[PDB]
Amino acid sequence: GPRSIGTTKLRLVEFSAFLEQQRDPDSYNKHLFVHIGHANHSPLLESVDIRQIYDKFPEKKGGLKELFGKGPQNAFFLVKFWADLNCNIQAGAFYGVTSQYESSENMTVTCSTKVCSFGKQVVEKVETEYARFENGRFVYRINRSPMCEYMINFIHKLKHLPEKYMMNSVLENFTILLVVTNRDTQETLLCMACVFEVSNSEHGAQHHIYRLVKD
Numbered sequence: 001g002p003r004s005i006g007t008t009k010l011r012l013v014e015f016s017a018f019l020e021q022q023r024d025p026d027s028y029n030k031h032l033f034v035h036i037g038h039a040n041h042s043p044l045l046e047s048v049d050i051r052q053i054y055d056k057f058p059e060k061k062g063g064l065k066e067l068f069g070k071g072p073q074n075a076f077f078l079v080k081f082w083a084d085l086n087c088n089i090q091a092g093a094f095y096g097v098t099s100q101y102e103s104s105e106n107m108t109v110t111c112s113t114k115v116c117s118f119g120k121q122v123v124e125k126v127e128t129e130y131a132r133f134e135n136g137r138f139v140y141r142i143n144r145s146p147m148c149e150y151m152i153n154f155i156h157k158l159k160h161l162p163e164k165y166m167m168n169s170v171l172e173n174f175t176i177l178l179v180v181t182n183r184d185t186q187e188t189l190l191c192m193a194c195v196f197e198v199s200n201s202e203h204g205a206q207h208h209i210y211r212l213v214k215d
């Protein structure tokens with residue numbers, strides 16, 4: 001389906017959370033838990049009433065209601081990810097996150113990743129990205145960013161469960177809020193309220209995009 005998520009001002013074009021393992025000195029394995037390379041869409045985006053997801057993200061000061069309210073509203077998305085947890089976790093391992101945003105405008109952006117448990121923040125990663133002019137447009141690349149220990153521990157404890165339904169029950173209360181801001185104007189460029197489920201057998205990691213609307 002669609003390649004990227006975002007507006008004309010800012011688009012997320014690439015994203016993957018992965019594990020790199022050195023099997024031996026001449027061998028390397030890479031496994032993707034989640035990525036945006038396979039949109040399960042056949043497009044005009046379907047919408048979700050934002051009031052149905054407030055409980056799942058931090059509220060009060062700095063919260064999703066406050067952010068959505070300040071706008072712009074066309075920059076707010078709900079992204080459903082199916083996580084691929086089929087990998088043998090073996091020392092010589094790297095858990096990383098790669099993301100790439102693009103713009104027509106030359107900006108300095110702030111990328112905030114809030115990991116949430118039961119709607120409450122457990123981790124916040126703030127990364128500042130400066131525009132790189134590449135073949136006609138500005139690119140903001142966060143290459144191989146180290147995964148936070150919380151998330152490394154979470155992936156291990158989730159894999160330990162003997163059934164996908166048990167992992168889905170855990171992932172029901174696990175969310176990620178991604179916010180990209182113009183560091184100089186303070187304008188919200190892109191907001192993604194991420195929800196998670198485990199992928200169904202042989203299909204692999206997938207995602208589905210919805211527009212967040214108030215009414």
Ligand SMILES: Cn1cc2c3cc(C(=O)O)ccc3n(-c3ccc(C(F)(F)F)cc3)c2n1
Pocket residue numbers: 017033034081083084085097113125145146147148151154155158176194196
């Ligand atoms: C859209 N998004 C952003 C991220 C992200 C950031 C980090 C980080 O910066 O430390 C770590 C893991 C992250 N994942 C992520 C989610 C679920 C699973 C799991 F457990 F389901 F496999 C595995 C990784 C994400 N998805």
